[PDB]
Amino acid sequence: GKEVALTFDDGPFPIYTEKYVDILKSMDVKATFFVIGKHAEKHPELLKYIVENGNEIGLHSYSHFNMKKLKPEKMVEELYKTQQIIVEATGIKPTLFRPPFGAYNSTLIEISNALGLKVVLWNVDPDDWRNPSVESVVNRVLSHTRDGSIILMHEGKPSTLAALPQIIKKLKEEGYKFVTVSELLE
Amino acid sequence: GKEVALTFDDGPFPIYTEKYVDILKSMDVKATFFVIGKHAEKHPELLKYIVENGNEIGLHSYSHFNMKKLKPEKMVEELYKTQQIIVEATGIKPTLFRPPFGAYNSTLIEISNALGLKVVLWNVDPDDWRNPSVESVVNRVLSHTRDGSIILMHEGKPSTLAALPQIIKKLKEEGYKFVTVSELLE
Ligand code: NI
Ligand code: NI
Protein backbone atom coordinates (compact mmCIF):
# COMPACT_ATOMS: atom_id res chain seq x y z
CA GLY A 1 0.00 0.00 0.00
CA LYS A 2 1.04 3.59 -0.95
CA GLU A 3 -1.64 6.30 -0.35
CA VAL A 4 -1.85 9.99 -1.40
CA ALA A 5 -4.35 12.70 -0.45
CA LEU A 6 -5.27 15.28 -3.12
CA THR A 7 -6.55 18.50 -1.48
CA PHE A 8 -8.33 21.64 -2.87
CA ASP A 9 -8.31 24.97 -0.93
CA ASP A 10 -10.43 28.15 -1.27
CA GLY A 11 -13.72 26.76 -2.69
CA PRO A 12 -16.43 26.11 -3.49
CA PHE A 13 -16.53 28.14 -6.82
CA PRO A 14 -19.47 28.13 -9.34
CA ILE A 15 -18.54 26.10 -12.55
CA TYR A 16 -15.05 24.84 -11.27
CA THR A 17 -16.24 22.90 -8.14
CA GLU A 18 -18.56 20.82 -10.40
CA LYS A 19 -15.72 20.43 -12.96
CA TYR A 20 -13.12 19.21 -10.34
CA VAL A 21 -15.69 16.76 -8.83
CA ASP A 22 -16.83 15.24 -12.22
CA ILE A 23 -13.14 14.47 -13.05
CA LEU A 24 -12.54 12.80 -9.64
CA LYS A 25 -15.83 10.75 -9.83
CA SER A 26 -15.07 9.67 -13.45
CA MET A 27 -11.57 8.35 -12.48
CA ASP A 28 -12.86 6.49 -9.29
CA VAL A 29 -10.72 8.87 -7.08
CA LYS A 30 -11.61 10.94 -3.94
CA ALA A 31 -10.17 14.20 -2.52
CA THR A 32 -10.47 16.66 0.36
CA PHE A 33 -11.92 20.14 -0.19
CA PHE A 34 -10.86 22.79 2.38
CA VAL A 35 -13.70 25.25 1.89
CA ILE A 36 -13.86 29.03 2.79
CA GLY A 37 -17.04 29.73 4.88
CA LYS A 38 -18.10 32.87 2.92
CA HIS A 39 -17.91 30.83 -0.31
CA ALA A 40 -19.66 27.80 1.24
CA GLU A 41 -22.69 29.73 2.54
CA LYS A 42 -23.27 31.31 -0.94
CA HIS A 43 -23.12 27.81 -2.61
CA PRO A 44 -24.54 25.14 -0.26
CA GLU A 45 -25.60 22.86 -3.23
CA LEU A 46 -21.87 22.74 -4.33
CA LEU A 47 -20.93 21.32 -0.82
CA LYS A 48 -23.74 18.68 -1.23
CA TYR A 49 -22.11 17.97 -4.64
CA ILE A 50 -18.56 17.49 -3.13
CA VAL A 51 -19.88 15.02 -0.51
CA GLU A 52 -22.50 12.97 -2.51
CA ASN A 53 -19.51 12.10 -4.78
CA GLY A 54 -17.61 10.58 -1.73
CA ASN A 55 -15.17 13.53 -1.11
CA GLU A 56 -14.25 14.94 2.37
CA ILE A 57 -14.92 18.57 3.30
CA GLY A 58 -12.57 20.42 5.70
CA LEU A 59 -12.65 24.01 7.00
CA HIS A 60 -10.39 26.78 5.56
CA SER A 61 -11.92 29.42 7.95
CA TYR A 62 -14.93 31.72 7.38
CA SER A 63 -13.12 34.92 6.15
CA HIS A 64 -9.78 33.44 4.85
CA PHE A 65 -7.66 35.94 6.88
CA ASN A 66 -4.35 35.07 8.58
CA MET A 67 -5.50 33.64 11.97
CA LYS A 68 -2.05 33.82 13.67
CA LYS A 69 -2.93 36.98 15.67
CA LEU A 70 -6.72 36.53 16.29
CA LYS A 71 -8.10 36.60 19.86
CA PRO A 72 -9.39 33.10 20.89
CA GLU A 73 -13.14 34.08 20.62
CA LYS A 74 -12.46 35.30 17.05
CA MET A 75 -10.80 31.89 16.25
CA VAL A 76 -13.98 30.25 17.67
CA GLU A 77 -16.25 32.46 15.47
CA GLU A 78 -14.28 31.76 12.27
CA LEU A 79 -14.26 27.95 12.90
CA TYR A 80 -17.73 27.45 14.43
CA LYS A 81 -19.57 29.49 11.71
CA THR A 82 -17.84 27.41 8.96
CA GLN A 83 -18.61 24.08 10.76
CA GLN A 84 -22.29 25.14 10.99
CA ILE A 85 -22.51 26.24 7.32
CA ILE A 86 -21.03 22.86 6.28
CA VAL A 87 -23.21 20.60 8.53
CA GLU A 88 -26.44 22.55 7.56
CA ALA A 89 -25.57 22.08 3.83
CA THR A 90 -24.44 18.34 3.88
CA GLY A 91 -25.45 16.73 7.23
CA ILE A 92 -21.71 15.60 7.56
CA LYS A 93 -19.63 17.27 10.34
CA PRO A 94 -16.09 18.07 9.18
CA THR A 95 -13.11 16.92 11.32
CA LEU A 96 -10.20 18.83 9.61
CA PHE A 97 -9.11 22.46 9.38
CA ARG A 98 -6.34 23.96 7.20
CA PRO A 99 -5.50 27.49 8.39
CA PRO A 100 -5.15 30.24 5.78
CA PHE A 101 -1.46 30.43 4.66
CA GLY A 102 -0.86 27.47 7.05
CA ALA A 103 -0.28 30.10 9.79
CA TYR A 104 -1.11 28.75 13.30
CA ASN A 105 -0.08 28.86 16.91
CA SER A 106 -0.64 26.62 19.99
CA THR A 107 -3.78 28.61 20.84
CA LEU A 108 -5.28 27.86 17.40
CA ILE A 109 -4.43 24.11 17.87
CA GLU A 110 -6.14 24.13 21.34
CA ILE A 111 -9.28 25.97 20.02
CA SER A 112 -9.47 23.72 16.89
CA ASN A 113 -9.24 20.51 19.05
CA ALA A 114 -11.96 21.78 21.41
CA LEU A 115 -14.28 22.09 18.36
CA GLY A 116 -13.43 18.45 17.34
CA LEU A 117 -11.05 19.66 14.52
CA LYS A 118 -7.49 18.49 13.62
CA VAL A 119 -5.27 21.09 11.95
CA VAL A 120 -3.62 19.96 8.75
CA LEU A 121 -1.11 21.64 6.50
CA TRP A 122 0.35 19.79 3.45
CA ASN A 123 3.78 18.39 2.42
CA VAL A 124 3.63 18.73 -1.45
CA ASP A 125 3.21 22.31 -2.87
CA PRO A 126 3.20 22.50 -6.71
CA ASP A 127 2.70 26.35 -6.32
CA ASP A 128 -0.58 26.09 -8.39
CA TRP A 129 -1.99 29.41 -6.88
CA ARG A 130 0.39 31.55 -9.05
CA ASN A 131 -1.05 29.93 -12.29
CA PRO A 132 1.84 27.94 -13.90
CA SER A 133 2.22 25.66 -17.00
CA VAL A 134 -0.11 22.62 -16.70
CA GLU A 135 3.00 20.44 -17.50
CA SER A 136 4.99 22.21 -14.67
CA VAL A 137 2.24 21.47 -12.03
CA VAL A 138 2.29 17.75 -13.05
CA ASN A 139 6.16 17.52 -12.76
CA ARG A 140 6.33 19.07 -9.23
CA VAL A 141 3.47 16.78 -8.04
CA LEU A 142 5.02 13.62 -9.60
CA SER A 143 8.65 14.36 -8.56
CA HIS A 144 7.66 15.21 -4.90
CA THR A 145 4.84 12.69 -4.13
CA ARG A 146 5.81 9.86 -1.65
CA ASP A 147 3.62 7.53 0.49
CA GLY A 148 1.63 9.80 2.87
CA SER A 149 1.79 12.92 0.63
CA ILE A 150 -0.89 15.61 1.19
CA ILE A 151 -0.87 17.68 -2.03
CA LEU A 152 -1.90 21.36 -1.70
CA MET A 153 -3.91 22.52 -4.74
CA HIS A 154 -6.54 25.26 -5.17
CA GLU A 155 -10.16 25.19 -6.43
CA GLY A 156 -11.18 27.70 -9.20
CA LYS A 157 -7.95 27.27 -11.30
CA PRO A 158 -8.26 26.12 -14.99
CA SER A 159 -4.47 25.25 -15.07
CA THR A 160 -5.28 22.92 -12.07
CA LEU A 161 -8.45 21.46 -13.76
CA ALA A 162 -6.08 20.69 -16.71
CA ALA A 163 -3.35 18.95 -14.59
CA LEU A 164 -5.75 16.66 -12.67
CA PRO A 165 -6.12 13.70 -15.12
CA GLN A 166 -2.35 13.38 -15.90
CA ILE A 167 -1.51 13.58 -12.09
CA ILE A 168 -4.17 10.94 -11.27
CA LYS A 169 -3.12 8.71 -14.20
CA LYS A 170 0.68 8.71 -13.49
CA LEU A 171 0.19 8.20 -9.69
CA LYS A 172 -2.25 5.32 -10.36
CA GLU A 173 0.53 3.87 -12.64
CA GLU A 174 3.16 4.37 -9.85
CA GLY A 175 0.86 2.24 -7.53
CA TYR A 176 -0.76 5.01 -5.36
CA LYS A 177 -4.32 4.68 -3.94
CA PHE A 178 -6.20 8.04 -3.58
CA VAL A 179 -7.59 8.66 -0.05
CA THR A 180 -9.29 11.48 1.91
CA VAL A 181 -7.03 13.26 4.43
CA SER A 182 -8.93 11.57 7.28
CA GLU A 183 -8.45 8.09 5.83
CA LEU A 184 -4.69 8.90 5.18
CA LEU A 185 -4.12 9.90 8.90
CA GLU A 186 -6.74 7.41 10.45
CA GLY B 1 4.66 42.35 15.27
CA LYS B 2 5.22 40.02 12.25
CA GLU B 3 7.37 36.90 12.96
CA VAL B 4 8.94 34.28 10.63
CA ALA B 5 10.74 31.01 11.43
CA LEU B 6 13.65 29.99 9.17
CA THR B 7 14.20 26.20 9.33
CA PHE B 8 17.04 23.89 8.08
CA ASP B 9 16.46 20.12 7.54
CA ASP B 10 18.90 17.19 7.10
CA GLY B 11 21.97 18.41 9.07
CA PRO B 12 24.36 18.80 10.65
CA PHE B 13 26.97 18.75 7.76
CA PRO B 14 30.76 19.42 8.17
CA ILE B 15 31.71 22.92 6.72
CA TYR B 16 28.04 24.05 5.87
CA THR B 17 26.54 23.88 9.43
CA GLU B 18 29.28 26.29 10.63
CA LYS B 19 28.73 28.47 7.51
CA TYR B 20 24.89 28.71 7.99
CA VAL B 21 25.33 29.50 11.75
CA ASP B 22 28.04 32.25 11.26
CA ILE B 23 25.67 34.06 8.80
CA LEU B 24 22.71 33.88 11.24
CA LYS B 25 24.86 35.03 14.26
CA SER B 26 26.39 37.91 12.21
CA MET B 27 22.91 39.24 11.20
CA ASP B 28 21.45 38.95 14.81
CA VAL B 29 18.94 36.27 13.54
CA LYS B 30 18.00 32.77 14.91
CA ALA B 31 16.69 29.61 13.19
CA THR B 32 15.56 26.04 13.83
CA PHE B 33 17.69 23.08 12.69
CA PHE B 34 15.80 19.79 12.19
CA VAL B 35 18.72 17.39 12.48
CA ILE B 36 19.03 13.72 11.22
CA GLY B 37 20.19 11.45 14.12
CA LYS B 38 22.86 9.57 12.08
CA HIS B 39 24.38 12.95 11.09
CA ALA B 40 24.07 14.37 14.63
CA GLU B 41 25.88 11.47 16.37
CA LYS B 42 28.85 11.77 13.91
CA HIS B 43 29.10 15.58 14.60
CA PRO B 44 28.12 16.37 18.21
CA GLU B 45 30.34 19.55 18.29
CA LEU B 46 28.25 20.96 15.33
CA LEU B 47 25.02 20.59 17.49
CA LYS B 48 26.83 22.45 20.37
CA TYR B 49 27.67 25.08 17.69
CA ILE B 50 23.96 25.45 16.54
CA VAL B 51 22.78 25.95 20.16
CA GLU B 52 25.58 28.15 21.69
CA ASN B 53 24.64 30.62 18.89
CA GLY B 54 20.97 30.76 20.22
CA ASN B 55 19.36 28.46 17.54
CA GLU B 56 16.73 25.71 18.28
CA ILE B 57 17.37 22.06 17.44
CA GLY B 58 14.47 19.78 16.41
CA LEU B 59 14.42 16.08 15.42
CA HIS B 60 14.23 14.93 11.75
CA SER B 61 14.37 11.20 12.80
CA TYR B 62 17.43 8.94 13.24
CA SER B 63 17.52 7.24 9.76
CA HIS B 64 15.57 9.80 7.61
CA PHE B 65 13.21 7.11 6.18
CA ASN B 66 9.49 7.66 5.50
CA MET B 67 7.88 6.93 8.93
CA LYS B 68 4.28 6.63 7.63
CA LYS B 69 4.29 2.79 7.77
CA LEU B 70 6.62 2.09 10.78
CA LYS B 71 5.37 -0.04 13.71
CA PRO B 72 4.97 2.14 16.89
CA GLU B 73 8.11 0.69 18.64
CA LYS B 74 10.14 1.59 15.52
CA MET B 75 8.73 5.19 15.69
CA VAL B 76 9.85 5.22 19.37
CA GLU B 77 13.39 4.00 18.44
CA GLU B 78 13.84 6.59 15.65
CA LEU B 79 12.64 9.49 17.92
CA TYR B 80 14.14 8.44 21.28
CA LYS B 81 17.66 7.71 19.85
CA THR B 82 17.71 11.20 18.18
CA GLN B 83 16.46 12.94 21.38
CA GLN B 84 19.25 11.19 23.34
CA ILE B 85 21.98 12.05 20.79
CA ILE B 86 20.87 15.72 20.93
CA VAL B 87 20.59 16.05 24.76
CA GLU B 88 24.01 14.25 25.29
CA ALA B 89 25.65 16.69 22.79
CA THR B 90 24.02 20.03 23.97
CA GLY B 91 22.30 19.51 27.38
CA ILE B 92 19.09 21.06 25.74
CA LYS B 93 16.11 18.67 25.20
CA PRO B 94 14.38 19.30 21.86
CA THR B 95 10.57 19.79 21.78
CA LEU B 96 9.89 19.63 17.97
CA PHE B 97 9.96 16.91 15.32
CA ARG B 98 9.60 17.30 11.53
CA PRO B 99 8.93 13.90 9.92
CA PRO B 100 10.90 12.97 6.79
CA PHE B 101 8.91 14.11 3.69
CA GLY B 102 6.34 15.53 6.18
CA ALA B 103 4.69 12.06 6.09
CA TYR B 104 2.79 11.28 9.35
CA ASN B 105 -0.26 9.58 10.74
CA SER B 106 -2.26 9.81 14.02
CA THR B 107 -0.07 7.08 15.53
CA LEU B 108 3.09 9.13 14.85
CA ILE B 109 1.40 12.22 16.47
CA GLU B 110 0.45 10.12 19.57
CA ILE B 111 4.00 8.59 19.89
CA SER B 112 5.68 12.02 19.30
CA ASN B 113 3.48 13.69 22.03
CA ALA B 114 4.25 10.88 24.51
CA LEU B 115 7.98 11.69 24.06
CA GLY B 116 7.27 15.43 24.73
CA LEU B 117 7.55 16.31 20.96
CA LYS B 118 5.25 18.45 18.75
CA VAL B 119 5.19 17.55 15.06
CA VAL B 120 5.78 20.44 12.69
CA LEU B 121 5.70 20.66 8.94
CA TRP B 122 6.19 24.04 7.15
CA ASN B 123 4.02 26.42 5.06
CA VAL B 124 6.67 28.05 2.73
CA ASP B 125 8.61 25.66 0.38
CA PRO B 126 11.12 27.43 -1.96
CA ASP B 127 12.01 23.89 -3.35
CA ASP B 128 15.72 24.48 -2.32
CA TRP B 129 16.48 20.64 -2.20
CA ARG B 130 16.53 20.41 -6.06
CA ASN B 131 19.34 23.11 -6.23
CA PRO B 132 17.82 26.18 -8.01
CA SER B 133 19.05 29.72 -8.93
CA VAL B 134 19.98 31.66 -5.74
CA GLU B 135 17.74 34.52 -7.10
CA SER B 136 14.82 32.02 -7.60
CA VAL B 137 15.02 30.76 -3.94
CA VAL B 138 14.88 34.41 -2.70
CA ASN B 139 11.78 35.24 -4.89
CA ARG B 140 9.71 32.20 -3.72
CA VAL B 141 10.61 32.95 -0.04
CA LEU B 142 9.82 36.72 -0.36
CA SER B 143 6.61 36.30 -2.45
CA HIS B 144 5.17 33.56 -0.10
CA THR B 145 6.26 34.72 3.41
CA ARG B 146 3.39 36.06 5.66
CA ASP B 147 3.18 36.50 9.47
CA GLY B 148 3.60 33.00 10.99
CA SER B 149 5.54 31.53 8.02
CA ILE B 150 7.71 28.44 8.71
CA ILE B 151 10.18 28.31 5.78
CA LEU B 152 11.47 24.84 4.79
CA MET B 153 15.14 24.99 3.72
CA HIS B 154 17.92 22.36 3.78
CA GLU B 155 21.39 22.32 5.39
CA GLY B 156 24.43 21.39 3.17
CA LYS B 157 23.29 23.45 0.09
CA PRO B 158 25.65 26.20 -1.28
CA SER B 159 22.71 27.74 -3.32
CA THR B 160 20.92 28.04 0.12
CA LEU B 161 24.06 29.48 1.89
CA ALA B 162 24.02 32.07 -0.96
CA ALA B 163 20.30 33.03 -0.60
CA LEU B 164 20.39 33.52 3.20
CA PRO B 165 21.63 37.16 3.49
CA GLN B 166 19.26 38.58 0.79
CA ILE B 167 16.25 36.68 2.38
CA ILE B 168 17.17 37.95 5.88
CA LYS B 169 17.81 41.51 4.61
CA LYS B 170 14.54 41.91 2.60
CA LEU B 171 12.36 40.34 5.39
CA LYS B 172 14.02 42.61 7.99
CA GLU B 173 13.12 45.53 5.61
CA GLU B 174 9.49 44.25 5.31
CA GLY B 175 9.29 44.42 9.20
CA TYR B 176 9.66 40.66 10.12
CA LYS B 177 11.32 39.52 13.38
CA PHE B 178 13.17 36.13 13.11
CA VAL B 179 12.07 33.55 15.75
CA THR B 180 12.65 29.86 16.58
CA VAL B 181 9.72 27.56 15.71
CA SER B 182 8.97 27.17 19.43
CA GLU B 183 8.84 30.92 20.02
CA LEU B 184 6.63 31.33 16.83
CA LEU B 185 4.02 28.73 18.15
CA GLU B 186 4.48 29.53 21.97
NI1 NI C 1 -6.43 29.53 0.98
NI1 NI D 1 14.77 15.71 5.17
Numbering used by the authors:
A (entry chain A), B (entry chain A): 136 to 321
Question: What do the study authors state?
Answer:
Based on sequence and secondary structure analyses, NTR was confirmed to be an intrinsically disordered region.
Our previous study revealed the crystal structure of the wild‐type (WT) enzyme containing the NTR and the catalytic domain. In this study, we investigated the role of the NTR through functional and structural analyses of NTR truncation mutants. The truncation of NTR significantly decreased the solubility of the proteins at low salt concentrations compared with that of the WT. The NTR‐truncated mutant easily crystallized in a conventional buffer solution.
